[PDB]
């Protein structure tokens, strides 16, 4: 499942990701952009035994449990596979824990490398939210 720029923003907004820990609705859609490019089944593997999953590209080492990663914490306490659904709740719900975690959104490399400050509102342009 591959969300729409705004089709997303809307589901992201509903989940209340706006002004989240000072993160505007734009900070998110920008990350989900550069990360999975809005794909809910996106997976990428690393050179540490870990795999990032779904739209926000949560990572098995700390966040979810995929049964094969070393030094697994499962902070979001969920099977990573749930992170692959079309229902961005797993994902959105899990990102919320990542933030609490005092680096903020710096955790999203593609965020923190493609939309630091910048004009994240870009992504909401015309997004009637």
């Amino acid at each position, epitope marked *: 499942k591959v969300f729409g720029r705004c089709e997303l923003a809307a589901a992201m907004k509903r989940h209340g990701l706006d002004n989240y820990r000072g993160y505007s609705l734009g900070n998110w859609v920008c990350a989900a952009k550069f990360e999975s490019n809005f794909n809910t*089944q996106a*997976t990428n*593997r*690393n*050179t*540490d*035994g870990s795999t990032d999953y779904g739209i926000l590209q949560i990572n098995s080492r700390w966040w979810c449990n*995929d*049964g*094969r*990663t*070393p030094g697994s914490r499962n902070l979001c306490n969920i*099977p990573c*596979s749930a992170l*692959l659904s079309s229902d961005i709740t797993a994902s959105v719900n899990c990102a919320k824990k990542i933030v609490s975690d005092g680096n903020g959104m710096n955790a999203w490399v593609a965020w923190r490398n493609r939309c630091k400050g910048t004009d994240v509102q870009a992504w909401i342009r015309g997004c009637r939210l």
Partner: antibody
Amino acid sequence: QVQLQESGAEVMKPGASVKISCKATGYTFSTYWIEWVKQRPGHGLEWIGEILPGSGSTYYNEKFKGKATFTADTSSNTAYMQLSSLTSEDSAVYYCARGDGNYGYWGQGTTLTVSS
Amino acid sequence: DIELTQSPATLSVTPGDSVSLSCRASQSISNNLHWYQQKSHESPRLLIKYVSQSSSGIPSRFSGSGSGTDFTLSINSVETEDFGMYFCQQSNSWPRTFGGGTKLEIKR
């Protein structure tokens, strides 16, 4: 007990295809990845790829991408692998294994022979 | 891919002797290597995981250690039942890679 049961020997013409199945019992089947491995007599093992059954997600070793094709029936608890356009070089034993980092649980193997 | 190269290809050992198998990774796979044993016909069988953790049921005779690019499985006192093929696999990256196997035959 966690078990993986695979299909029996296959003897095929060159150019046809085959579909090796991997029925897996004893665990939340949507949770772990199924990885496939190939063992040709004279080579070591060779990783073909993996499927996370039910998610739509698969990854191929660049070599096999285009010739292996993983699907899965969450209903039945079977993951399948299709290999098409069979050449002599396809004749081997294939295995499904549940993706644990290590592979602690393997299937019994399936022997494929390709010949005219 | 990360190429693991095994040595020796073959090894003839008298039962009761000790042996070391070598697995060297083309690049640091950190602590992400497992060893399997395979008797003729059957699926491989995990002996060691993440370089050195015992999988229950495996005879204490089998132990592993190492790190970086060099791993070793040691079989202290080989029985007649330890003879088959022996592979190391990495789970660091994808594709997963297996070494070429060390074939352990009985000396007589």
